[model samples]
Target: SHMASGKRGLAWPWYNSPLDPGVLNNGDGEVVAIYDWETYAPPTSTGGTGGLGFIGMQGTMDSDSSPVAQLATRQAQQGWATVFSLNEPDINGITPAEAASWYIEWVNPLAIKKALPAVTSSTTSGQGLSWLSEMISACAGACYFDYINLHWYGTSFAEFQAYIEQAHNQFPSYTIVISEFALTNGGNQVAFFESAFPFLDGLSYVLLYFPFVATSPALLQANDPGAVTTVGTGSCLYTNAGGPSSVGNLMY
Candidate 1:
């Protein structure tokens, strides 16, 4: 009835406050709704006290039992596009080798078990080589997720473009997403944006300033990058001007 009437309504309940209420309460059209719970890896049992090197706590955000379950619920309702927005983001600190291994061993396996998407990225430790080497040598585990989300924070367009090209060469057959990108200087982003957008297959461009968020594309890129015919603003940083949109046209 609500969808037919052209009104958007939603309900967002919770076990706690870590969940983003805005994303949950704003679906499409006014109507009654429900919020259920899912499950995921248990939080660092140590509570990050001693910081005993929490393995799963790689991204800037944490996704333990509560948050992961909440995110999974939101994804199930909003779909895969939304899911990618909140999963383990770019792990710039970890090496690609370590990242490859972490994904194959801990991250991907758990994702499949939980019925979630499997994604790998560089972490705070910088290119996870230890974990990555394990992934290549084993070659017997399930690879999770549909795309490889990477973070590129280069000083120039040439460097950033090279990074993307290298990633594609290394992980053939995997979809690519520049999960995060920003300019070293405040004024140089335009060049990076203009030059790099054409290469992004279907990334939720990382945009900083103004609206300060990323946008999801209608179609994502996979193997044979020639299929990517559109430009991507890439990812952005949080801003105060407006909200996020795939078309990149929304005002705060």
Candidate 2:
């Protein structure tokens, strides 16, 4: 069944496609499909429509690539919103200035010409945090992004929040989304779930020591203790033996 618009929205498997998979079957099915665009479309594929209309323009440079135009055209014709994703384009092989320049060229143009939301992604956790701020500053009057994306792992909550606060201070207009976040539970899956929290809209338990959170939804779903309180092997009571046992012994 089509969405009354007479378009048969097909859901193509993007991972195996040659062109933005959306182009293959045209997502003519009744359900909306998410497609990975890089494997299927050119760096400038802004005119594809139908199932081809949907694209996950995964992480791109700041230059104007017209991704939304392709999806927008498709969406305008098909009546469905397609994803316009951004990845570590700024963090890739280019210099900081080059990356910034590229972003302004590609990304700014989309904001200038389209109403589509661009998802800007960051690779590194700390320094790259600044890159997001840079992107936000450059996005003024441009198509505002739907989300500020990053992959954060291995960092303590305190450290993550510290950087997050910095990003907010610098780019208050953007929302933070950890596109990927997980902890290596050191092979103790059960123990990992003990600390798991599932407010995260996305979760995968594949990284070895990390608990397979998706598989243990109950362990992490809506528990205040996950955010506060203590747990085994690592808790408030646990401290480094390397430090003086008493605070009085330390001299700052």
Candidate 3:
């Protein structure tokens, strides 16, 4: 059932070349959700990802194009069940205090499940969990969020496991959403995901876990060459032909 597999989602995007999400979920029932790192909803076309849940992502700040003034309206218009904020604030130089107020002002108004800005898995001080902690303190009970969002791209599975445990240990009450994660530096992606998927499924606190991406190798390079250089193409879920790649099959 799609509900049973609802825990999985895609850190999806067009990256200048759109990949039809429904083609990913067409006949399969494993992928239950998607988000294109924006406030606008991904088109739920007839028979293509129509049944798959769409989570809105406020990946950027109040800008002329994707204004903060329109956050609530967009959520209502799309009827999204959940919303993820700021893609990687920690790494992007967004201070937690600033993020907290922004969240309270914009995200708090939403009448849907809300996740804090996704922070990186970096171990540096004032980044990653530390940054999130600061933001919570800044919120001082003013911020309203149902989930703690995270992103990680590391070398080994054990390190990834430890990072998640650290997040859980720090914030035991809030459900977590790992919106991006994968092995970096040319590691074995197949082995990593094979072990990674089941571990995520077993977690009671993990509300959702989206792998690094949902795109093909060539398109990924064309769209986000940075990702291709860092995480490599082994983690890609789609092949050039728009079919499920080896990693995509694991979604089932």
Candidate 4:
């Protein structure tokens, strides 16, 4: 169902509030990019108010309107440096060939950097990195991209490190971007980040990463209640008062 907003949309169950801008500059000059999982939305286009950071868009919608054309228009209007393809298209029932065509049609035309469809860390048949491999083979050089996007949900840093390493081994040529990741059952995200950040920073191929979320508990509960039940509020980077959470302080 298309919202009254000029653009078409997806059937996502969650309603995400805008990420707090304070999370960007928390004096952590290490922050290099902001991704809102949309072509035209808050945080992604604003560039942290000072208007300086690599803005990244996700994909064109599958809607009644001219989806590909609308995505291209937003690409030009927003001037994002990078673009992330379909969110979990592999697991969402998008065939390899179908995703390849969509990538060539909408994503390939953009001059900026591009990432293949984001995939979960599922090891099931026809999923995860294997799904990406199939899509790349299906692309057959038609779909051009600069990065391989990944998403993972787990409990330990050891497991997180292993997954990233495995991804790098699988796609050695292309750089990797972890768009979403956190503990499955939340606890001590600050400790996780304290260990995880340095590991990610040391790896030359891990280009960018967004912690599982950057929103406050109240805002997250209000906007996307499902996330609270599924992922828990412990990973959230903001407090009820809208100040940085203990985990958020590690960003600086």
Order of the predicted models by TM-score, top scorer first: 3, 4, 1, 2
How many Å off is the CA of 115 in candidate 2?
12
The TM-score between candidate 3 and the true structure equals: 0.92
lDDT of 3 at 124: 87
lDDT of 1 by residue, 1-252 (tens): 233221111111122122222332233422112221222221221222111111121232334543533543533443322222223322334334444554454444334222122233343342322333344454354555554444444467777676666666666665543433544433345455556544442333321111112222221122212212322233222112223332232111
Clashing residue pairs, candidate 4?
none
lDDT of 2: 0.34
Could you estimate the TM-score for every candidate?
Answer: 0.43, 0.41, 0.92, 0.86
**Better by lDDT, candidate 4 or 1:** 4
Compared with the true structure, what per-residue lDDT tens digits does model 3 show for residues 1-252? Answer: 445545778777646245667666654555788888887666433424546788888888876656878888888888899888888889887888889888887888898899999998877889988898899999998988899999988999999998888889989998999999999957899899898888888899998899988888888888788988899889988887777888888876
lDDT of 3 at 224: 89
Counted clashes in each candidate structure:
42, 35, 0, 0
List model 4 lDDT by residue over 49-89, tens digit each.
32334444544446433255677788787787777888888
lDDT of 2 by residue, 1-252 (tens): 223222212222222212222332323332233333332342212335323344344345322443434533443444433344455544455444454454455444333221122222244552465554554455554434455555443435444445445655765665444433333323332232233322121222111111111111222223323522222122111113222112101100
- CA lDDT of each prediction against the hidden true structure: 0.33, 0.34, 0.82, 0.70
- Model 3 weakest lDDT span, ten residues long: 41-50
Cα misplacement distance, residue 11 of candidate 3 (Å)? 1.4
